[PDB]
Symmetry: D2
Subunit: 500 residues, 4 copies
């Protein structure tokens, strides 16, 4: 008897008490007489095409892999439910918040960012925290990170930013030169960078980290009244991080540390919890705000905008088949039921398209048919048909054009989006200098203390030292802008490494 | 009011008595407030990405199409069942023939060959007749034509043959030069060609034609006793053909004539029936045979090898969704359950690979998950895992390696194939001159009569006339070899057009 | 002898003078000893996997097909060039209009709409006229129709519209009930419908018809000044249309009529020509305009906005390989270089996404790498990388992020788009009643005459008759709205067939 | 300053002396005015679809990934050439061995086995060593490992094996239970296992390990004379392995150790070298052979079958774009030009299908079009056409069927394969007990010494200990068979960890 995660097979066999083994068939259901030997003419003769038992299995085996997530490749999954503990209907009408005590099945997948499919879990990198709500009014995907902000505030830079974080095109190796060249050119990433290289940079598992929606969403109540908000879910298991020494060791001792940890916790009745809160901001305050409420590189102070309890997030069920329930799960930020809408956030606007579009590539056009993704707690009925690998009945033989005089599904005028009044030219408004220091300075100071500030600079210089000097300079100048000590301290550390 | 096929929508609505209209939702299940208008900034402003309702619908619509079958593109489908009427267990042990009265669900798809997705039904071209059996011991796919023979007897020429029958690479139009060049170079196709251009060349619907497995298959009884055979299923609706004049008209009047014809039949309780027969040849007669018993360009005479009743084939249900139940159904000749095996037939040997292979591209690696294809009458339990669009539970968390000491599915020693002894060199044995006239002559003479003979020659000349002269010559030479009158009669008609 | 199209193979062979035949290799380049026979153990033995020559060919053959266009499936292509004859640089700064006498290689593909890959050419249906300009400032695609307007003015209905125009979900047969139920619910379709069922409904070939960009575009000169416009290209061969009878016959006699006709013309130095014109409208008139200048269901009168000659369109080259140069060619209405931009036109706004989106599914994510589609007359240099089937050098080992301090490509501030001021709410503005009879009436009256009016109603009634009475009424109510005579005349004809 | 590998971007910038930066364009070649800001209505307004610049870049970025190799995912690549140093023409007629001094361009990709794309290099696992020769007679792919043998000898077990080597279906974590349960059930794996857990198990880079073809191949000379053989390429840099402690540290310090190490070597004119040898066995000795000459779990003793020098392998060129030149390169063992053929080896037989098949899925049906894969030193001319992403001219408008009378490519009777006479029943001959200890016992003793023995038993026990007891027992049992001391020693170590 070892950890539950190790006795998977042992427990699976223990479930089959007196039941005899199933009959080994092919793909079509035909039984196999011998699957341990290939057909040949003579004991030492060639293999003939006749062996359809071989090909069948082989062929499929040849198609086991699928393209990995362009980002957030390495991750882990689990299931549970979401419970409403407080009434916040005066803000949103969403069926998911209907009444207290209302439980809604959910799905969650944690992950890293730049790391590829075989990468290690315990490494400095933001964390992925996506939640899928199977509500009556359709599925609701809340794709969030473990940090309330981000490096850039314009989607048009994302493809590049990520490129910089990955491997070099020619060498296929991590390139500090790329990582900092971009960062040193986009001083807006300062905030997030400070947060990334801090202690929260390497959480001690998926259960010891918080979660935020990150972007600014919009909420609408049964009276068409709208208000902005931010989603936050605090770990009831406490915030815990691994030291640079431990993460590095575990990095190779157990690359799937995060995976194992989560699985064993659940398998042993140690179901992980998270508390759901929302920060509210009326339209009025939205203006008075000293910054761009929709600037992903900014946060909403808890003093002027306190968190409001909403419910609880609980994970009490591991997946049965990783590939089918995790690797295949897809979250779409556009999946928002009535009561929840988007906002003028550029990064959010650009995300409304990237995901569904990429899913049609990674999984397929009809990826919403795969169980995990299928909105079973709803009733899909529209005018879409066909597509490769079309499961179900393709909606049978119902009219496939709207409108029509034959009782086919109709639109519901109560599901209408909220309307806002905008005005101005239609152009590319430069947001490069939307103040990339203030909020950062307040963080380096008040938020952190001596120890942290020291460790932080250390963490940074340890990495930034491996870049060219001309890049090192730019970065420091940006850091100095945040605070004179923030810059110098790093400079001092670099001089040491640069020395020898 | 009108034919049931025309009142589809009307009947669908009629089925919804008091029921109210379902709520229109996006793909994720989210309800729509208005699907008749896109979101814009101002009544005359641009469109914004925010409208996911629009993109959701559009995006999917942009991915409705899938690659059509490389062959037998235009077809029709229907469902029914197979019923055993006579006991033939002394030949095969297949669970499908188990006991008399045993009914097994089946699927059928009729089709043409060269014609693309938008082609017309009533056209001179072989007909496709595939039957999928959902038996306990797995799915059984009997893919067959409406003709007992074929043009070539070697798979390595199929790709070319089909090419010659399709459009020209540069112009994209049917090229008579291509069609006859290949045929004039492969006299073995004479048999099938003679069949093709005869009256049966254009059946009057899919219900008035017979079906054959064509290939020589092997049967294995409960005692490891093997014997060869050939499947035949006769139309209980009689054999009817359309005249050149009629087929031409219908070719444009109603291109989907076949589809509509079948659909209304079933819809009107006029369920089509087919009688199942099998020709048995023992291993002994297998040698005595004057030809190659596995030669696809040769038939088994009903005199020496009479048909043996097996059962009935009935189609009593139209598909609910064409794309889902028909355009997506896949048939694999490899799908043969215990009791039925393949044979040394080259053309079939090459067919054992091509289908499953082509299916993984047309539909996908896990196409066997698509309902119509999934062998629901059996229990799939192996060590295959993953693959794009993986439905089901991927077999859950069960051992994924054989062997193993954890109770995973095991092989069944009783499903072992039948063993045969072979011997000789492993090379490319030329089968180009395996006699391409003997049976063909006996066809042109005894099988047909004055009228048919005349019409046939006419049908041929009418087509071959559009090809180059030097090609015409070669073809005539090959016909003359079948029968002196066969050729000359053609040559005569040709001179007229050519003149 | 015969037409150049029929003697394809012949001329190809004639091109190989004393040149000996190339050596037949496999896929990887290895020579083939015999491709006419498969490998087996003994003459009558089974086939073995060893024969990779067989599999290599067979497999590929099993993957020849690819999803056909979701719309405008059946088409024909040709190549030529565009030449500027008049100076309009005072309107647009586009490099393609740079100076008079400037020639720019082009690509063109004609098509139908609902008809699948196998359908016939000579059929009542709007025609597709796309043009690809291989300019220095990138490729510019001018995806147009043979009609200046369309059935609907909102993209969110298109999916549905094309659905109704196609096959029934269950029967898979054209369904008049759908076709008219939709049209009868969207009176905005009247205009185009009236045009479609007119004599221009079935052009005699692709060379005897006009083309228009249909949508309203925006033009910007070297001084940031922008004006709206509409593209029209008239056939220098004249407007010719086949009669109902003729088209019907040809619909089956030669389903590739349009393909054959165009190929031969080019083949015999009868290079088809079209003249390029443009309708200009300043921002001022854009307001005064009694209608919505961006309403695809409207037209700009020639009296108020005359056509202005710009250049000539010449097709002087047939494709060498249909599949490679035509079936694979992709047009993106989004591909507009500096000097030409989009407009508030909802229909056009939605198209900006639909095309590139579907191309990545039909052909692949790197379809811009396919020769015909690649913008060879320009230098592609960005930060995009990887992707399935990545041809070229994936841009070598260059910085793949922007910005950077390493010399990678930089943005050109001279290629900025034109900025326009907007304002208002962001919602779905209902544009279902933007007047659907005023211009339509002006067409039925002044545009046509006695004959055409008679023929039109005839054409319509002949079709709308096969629909359900309750549906028949609706349509008529709509036609009566356009003109009392328009509706009644149809009504009269209907009562006849309904009898 | 730093290693060449780190100063990539720097050196690329250096190459661009006085040249200005290229113009940043979209996919279609259209220039971009600002790629640092998305278009929105007002500074804080929503984003609109008009931003094709955004969508273009975005959409593509969304399709950057492609399925990774099912096996050997984490690897490195490089280019160089092969040079014949010795004459062996008396054995094979392959154009690559033509004459001494003949240089042929080659491609190489080294790799691990179970580890995924992001895994670490310095890990205990066999090493991938594939070579692609761009010969005149087509491409020749010699796909080999760093070990001369393998765990299993029948391909039908491969899928399972690899399954056991990877992650658990439920937990997704390596499962020592799976790894050993299979291994303990297939005693034939012993040989390879012993090698894997020896010091050669974790090579210090790709340049310090040897390469073998592993399988038994057949050679044919100009006079149809055939002999069997084995391929071996020793490293001219000597064999060097990292310690368990060292590999463990590098395993996290630099997971791309192997990639980096190789790149730099080449970048600093330290071009790695490998010598090519072959082991010949006539048909006669093939029989007298105490074992099955085609048993992949056996090796050919250098005393009875000495290495024969053939040439030199050199790698003098790094890739420019990893994705394009390395991640996309595909090696097909089937690719073997005249002179080199396969053998009855079951493991090889099954590989003749697996690769070309898996490639058609991972890259595409026309993957042989991607440069690195295209056989540029040969002329591809066959009868294959179409296929998704069809680059080139699809062979233009040439006859697409065989045979034909128009000068299309023709087969070369001199490229016919070598024929062998086989005899016996066609069934699944069990090969589970083909002696799994003899050659292993010889390895454990004479091959290794005290140190190695101890270190091997150590390395094994270190891993085998994390498996269930019952599994531990079976393993030891198998080990004991090899040699009493082999098993006991392991039993000893085990007892300690177990207690
Ligand atoms: C908003 C409505 C429309 C939508 C969403 C739409 C969508 C499409 C799509 C998805 C394709 C398939 C592209 C491919 O796979 O190659 C297509 C092709 C085509 N469409 Fe439309 N279309 C619309 C309106 C029109 C109109 C009004 C015209 C003419 C101005 C037109 C002319 C064509 C032509 C010529 C093609 C063939 C281009 C090619 O082969 O790539 N379409 N359309």
């Amino acid at each position: 008897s070892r950890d539950p995660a190790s006795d998977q097979m042992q427990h699976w066999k223990e479930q089959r008490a007196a039941q005899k083994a199933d009959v080994l068939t092919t793909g079509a259901g035909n039984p196999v007489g011998d699957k341990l030997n290939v057909i040949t003419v003579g004991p030492r003769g060639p293999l003939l095409v006749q062996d359809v038992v071989f090909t069948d299995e082989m062929a499929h085996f040849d198609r086991e892999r699928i393209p990995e997530r362009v980002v957030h490749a390495k991750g882990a999954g689990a299931f549970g439910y979401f419970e409403v503990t407080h009434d916040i209907t005066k803000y949103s009408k969403a069926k998911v918040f209907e009444h207290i005590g209302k439980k809604t099945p959910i799905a969650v997948r944690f992950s890293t960012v730049a790391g590829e499919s075989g990468s290690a879990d315990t490494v400095r990198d933001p964390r992925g925290f996506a939640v899928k709500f199977y509500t009556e009014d359709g599925n609701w995907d809340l794709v969030g990170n473990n940090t309330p902000i981000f490096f850039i505030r314009d989607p048009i830079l994302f493809p590049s930013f990520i490129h910089s974080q990955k491997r070099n095109p020619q060498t296929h190796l991590k390139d500090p030169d790329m990582v900092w060249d971009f960062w040193s050119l986009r001083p807006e990433s300062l905030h997030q960078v400070s947060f990334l290289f801090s202690d929260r940079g390497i959480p001690d598992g998926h259960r010891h980290m918080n979660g935020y929606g990150s972007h600014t969403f919009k909420l609408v109540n049964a009276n068409g009244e709208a208000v902005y908000c931010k989603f936050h879910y605090k770990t009831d298991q406490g915030i815990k991080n691994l030291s640079v020494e431990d993460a590095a060791r575990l990095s190779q001792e157990d690359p799937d540390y995060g995976i194992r940890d989560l699985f064993n916790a659940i398998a042993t009745g140690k179901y992980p919890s998270w508390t759901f809160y929302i920060q509210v901001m009326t339209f009025n305050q939205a203006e008075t705000f000293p910054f761009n409420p929709f600037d992903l590189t900014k946060v909403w102070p808890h003093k002027d905008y306190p968190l409001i309890p909403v419910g609880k997030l609980v994970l009490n069920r591991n997946p049965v088949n990783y590939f089918a329930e995790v690797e295949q799960i897809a979250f779409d930020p556009s999946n928002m039921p009535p009561g929840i809408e988007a906002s003028p956030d550029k990064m959010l606007q650009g995300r409304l398209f990237a995901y569904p579009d990429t899913h049609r590539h990674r999984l397929g056009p009809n990826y919403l048919h795969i169980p995990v993704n299928c909105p079973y707690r709803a009733r899909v009925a529209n005018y879409q048909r066909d597509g490769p690998m079309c499961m179900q009945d393709n909606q049978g033989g119902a009219p496939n054009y709207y409108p029509n005089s034959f009782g086919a599904p109709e639109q519901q005028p109560s599901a209408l989006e909220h309307s806002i009044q905008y005005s101005g030219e239609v152009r590319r408004f430069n947001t490069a200098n939307d103040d990339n220091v203030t909020q950062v300075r307040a963080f380096y100071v008040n938020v952190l203390n001596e120890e942290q500030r020291k460790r932080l600079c250390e963490n940074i210089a340890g990495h930034l030292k491996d870049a060219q000097i001309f890049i090192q300079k730019k970065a420091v100048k940006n850091f100095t802008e945040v605070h004179p000590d923030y810059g110098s301290h790093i400079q001092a550390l670099l001089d040491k490494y640069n020395a020898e």
